[PDB]
Amino acid sequence: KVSHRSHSTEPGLVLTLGQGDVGQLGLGENVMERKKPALVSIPEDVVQAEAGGMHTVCLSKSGQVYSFGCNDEGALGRDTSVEGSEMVPGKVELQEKVVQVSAGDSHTAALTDDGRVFLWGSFRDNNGVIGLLEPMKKSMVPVQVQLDVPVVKVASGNDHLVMLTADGDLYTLGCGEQGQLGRVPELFANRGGRQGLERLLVPKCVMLKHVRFQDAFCGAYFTFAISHEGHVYGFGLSNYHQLGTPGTESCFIPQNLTSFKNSTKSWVGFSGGQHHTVCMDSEGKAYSLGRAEYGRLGLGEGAEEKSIPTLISRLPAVSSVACGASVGYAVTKDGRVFAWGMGTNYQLGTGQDEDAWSPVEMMGKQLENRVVLSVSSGGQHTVLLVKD
Amino acid sequence: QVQFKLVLVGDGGTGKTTFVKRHLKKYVATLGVEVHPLVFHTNRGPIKFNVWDTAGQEKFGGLRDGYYIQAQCAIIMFDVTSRVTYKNVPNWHRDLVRVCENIPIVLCGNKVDIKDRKVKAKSIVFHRKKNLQYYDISAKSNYNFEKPFLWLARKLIGDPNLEFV
Numbered sequence: 001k002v003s004h005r006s007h008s009t010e011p012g013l014v015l016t017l018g019q020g021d022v023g024q025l026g027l028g029e030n031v032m033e034r035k036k037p038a039l040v041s042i043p044e045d046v047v048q049a050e051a052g053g054m055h056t057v058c059l060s061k062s063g064q065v066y067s068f069g070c071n072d073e074g075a076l077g078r079d080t081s082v083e084g085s086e087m088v089p090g091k092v093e094l095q096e097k098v099v100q101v102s103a104g105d106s107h108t109a110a111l112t113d114d115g116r117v118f119l120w121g122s123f124r125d126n127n128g129v130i131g132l133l134e135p136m137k138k139s140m141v142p143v144q145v146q147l148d149v150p151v152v153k154v155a156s157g158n159d160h161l162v163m164l165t166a167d168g169d170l171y172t173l174g175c176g177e178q179g180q181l182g183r184v185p186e187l188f189a190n191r192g193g194r195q196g197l198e199r200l201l202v203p204k205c206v207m208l209k210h211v212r213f214q215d216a217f218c219g220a221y222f223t224f225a226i227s228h229e230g231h232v233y234g235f236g237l238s239n240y241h242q243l244g245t246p247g248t249e250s251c252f253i254p255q256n257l258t259s260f261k262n263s264t265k266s267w268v269g270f271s272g273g274q275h276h277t278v279c280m281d282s283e284g285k286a287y288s289l290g291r292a293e294y295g296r297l298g299l300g301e302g303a304e305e306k307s308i309p310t311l312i313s314r315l316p317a318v319s320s321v322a323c324g325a326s327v328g329y330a331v332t333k334d335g336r337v338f339a340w341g342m343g344t345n346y347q348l349g350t351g352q353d354e355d356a357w358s359p360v361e362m363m364g365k366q367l368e369n370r371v372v373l374s375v376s377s378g379g380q381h382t383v384l385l386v387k388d
Numbered sequence: 389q390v391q392f393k394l395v396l397v398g399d400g401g402t403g404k405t406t407f408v409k410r411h412l413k414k415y416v417a418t419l420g421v422e423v424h425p426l427v428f429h430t431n432r433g434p435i436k437f438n439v440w441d442t443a444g445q446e447k448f449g450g451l452r453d454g455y456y457i458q459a460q461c462a463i464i465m466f467d468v469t470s471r472v473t474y475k476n477v478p479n480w481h482r483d484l485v486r487v488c489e490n491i492p493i494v495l496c497g498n499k500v501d502i503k504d505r506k507v508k509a510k511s512i513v514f515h516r517k518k519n520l521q522y523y524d525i526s527a528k529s530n531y532n533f534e535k536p537f538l539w540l541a542r543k544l545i546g547d548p549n550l551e552f553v
Contacts, residue, residue: 021513022471032513054472072470072510083509105472126444128401129470178448221448239450249450274447274479294482326479344478379475 002115002166004152006215007099010387011045011061012373015366018347018381022054023087025381026068031087035346036364037384042066042089049385051324051378052103053158058089058383063097065110066090073106073129074140077120094118094142102156102218105379107132107174109161110142115150118142123159123174123201125191130175135197145203147171157218157236162225163203168212170225171203178221179252180236182206186252208233208254219272219323224279225254232260232267240275240291241307259289259308273323273341278330279309284317286330295357298328298340303357314359324377330359335371337362337384345380392544393458394437397480398465399473400444403498406527407465408439411537418454420445428537431551435541437461446483447476456487461540463494468511468524469501481520492521492543494536499526 015037016025025031026040040058046066048059055069055076066089067076078093080086092110096118100111106129107121122129122138131137133145145163151171153164160174160181172181177189183206184192184199192199206225211233216225222236222243234243235254243251244259260267266282276290276297287309288297297303298312317333327341327348338359339348346353349362362372370386377383398404414422417440426437446455456462464480466473477495484493497514499507507524514522521539525532534552542550 021474053475070471073472075472105475106470124399124401124472126400126448237448239448249448293486325476342479342482344482380478 022070024069053105065092075121104156178237182235217270224270294342296341468497
């Protein structure tokens with residue numbers, strides 16, 4: 001029933017690389033690190049592969065969800081009582097046909113073909129677990145988010161979830177400490193203030209004098225939304241200019257970002273790590289802004305902090321972009337994938353742990369005779385969806 | 389008098405506040421960050437650690453390198469019972485080395501969920517590695533609560549025979 005351009009339908013194979021201390025690589029109890037893309041065995045073809053902070057969620061062609069990684073807060077949405085079960089792909093018991101998934105640091109969301117949203121795990125703030133849908137309570141199994149309207153897209157930051165409805169309304173829930181929910185006053189940022197967590201955990205609409213949206217994206221602690229008119233709105237953390245020049249380190253009130261006022265430009269994609277943002281326009285050009293350390297902007301060596309989207313010139317036409325905590329990626333129209341940023345966790349796929357201040361094409365045995373369909377990255381690992 | 393600036397970093401809810409409280413006035417040296425002076429008596433004289441509880445400001449604040457500048461040592465803390473808190477350890481480690489260089493750093497695995505005795509499996513992964521000195525700690529019996537400070541003190545003073553009294 002529901003549909004959105006963000007939905008993925010091309011069947012592929014899942015590859016992972018980086019650190020796997022808690023099972024996020026999905027390669028078994030003793031594979032703690034992969035310097036180059038490694039094939040993950042899944043019983044079916046996969047259409048979407050998302051990296052949470054320390055876990056991975058894959059969606060099969062048939063609409064079944066598989067997960068692996070840290071399940072301490074219930075993020076995997078399945079029983080991992082047996083030692084090692086979290087280190088390999090396992091099915092999420094959900095008798096629904098899922099069309100899209102999203103993953104945060106301790107939560108996972110799944111969108112059903114008819115527009116219902118299921119969620120599991122928990123949200124955390126700067127003082128610990130705040131709960132999932134009910135105060136101070138996580139859920140080890142999928143629970144439905146109560147909404148009286150169909151949702152067409154789900155997107156997750158580290159500890160917040162955004163849901164775009166069929167009507168263009170944007171609902172948000174989770175941690176709003178940095179303003180990433182775009183509907184809570186700074187006065188209630190800390191666990192809802194005197195009124196409590198209820199306000200943060202109950203899905204509520206982002207109301208702007210009302211503006212409707214056609215797409216939305218999440219960085220670690222901030223959110224971008226494109227209105228029906230094509231205007232770019234943002235809210236959340238901007239201490240390193242990840243939202244441009246909001247005029248504040250924490251943007252609680254959604255703002256029409258001046259740093260993104262086009263004319264002939266049409267922004268089509270946004271991604272973000274903790275302190276940087278990577279976006280792309282309708283012409284296949286990629287741009288970055290925010291903190292420059294360790295080369296996460298991909299603008300070359302000597303790069304400095306940027307407050308406006310800056311063109312990443314060393315890249316061919318791009319079809320999609322993605323960010324890890326301190327790394328950036330771009331998938332080209334021709335099916336190649338480039339990476340840049342901090343190399344410490346081996347997320348670059350260069351084989352080395354040196355930082356890359358400029359985009360570098362990922363190469364490896366598992367990438368030969370295959371095209372990259374998508375890339376998603378977490379705190380210490382990265383996940384690729386490829387096809388022959 | 390021997391005094392050291394110690395930076396304490398870690399995800400929220402990993403027990404940083406409780407950790408400091410149990411070793412106890414405090415003062416503000418900057419925005420959103422309280423400093424708690426801790427004095428340890430030893431066989432080499434008193435040693436004071438001025439503990440900066442960054443409280444996530446390194447992630448959300450605007451002092452940039454200001455949180456780490458002039459730090460002589462550090463403690464990176466995470467929750468061994470909620471391992472997603474280990475996510476930023478590499479970033480904290482890189483930043484500390486970039487801003488302070490080769491300062492001594494201790495990684496502390498805090499057992500916050502003191503209700504599940506299979507932490508000797510969730511923690512095994514951290515005793516391994518080796519780049520950083522690791523210690524298992526827990527609010528309750530102040531298990532190894534002094535270990536991190538003792539290790540740092542020995543490295544800072546350059547006396548392997550240093551002992552807390």
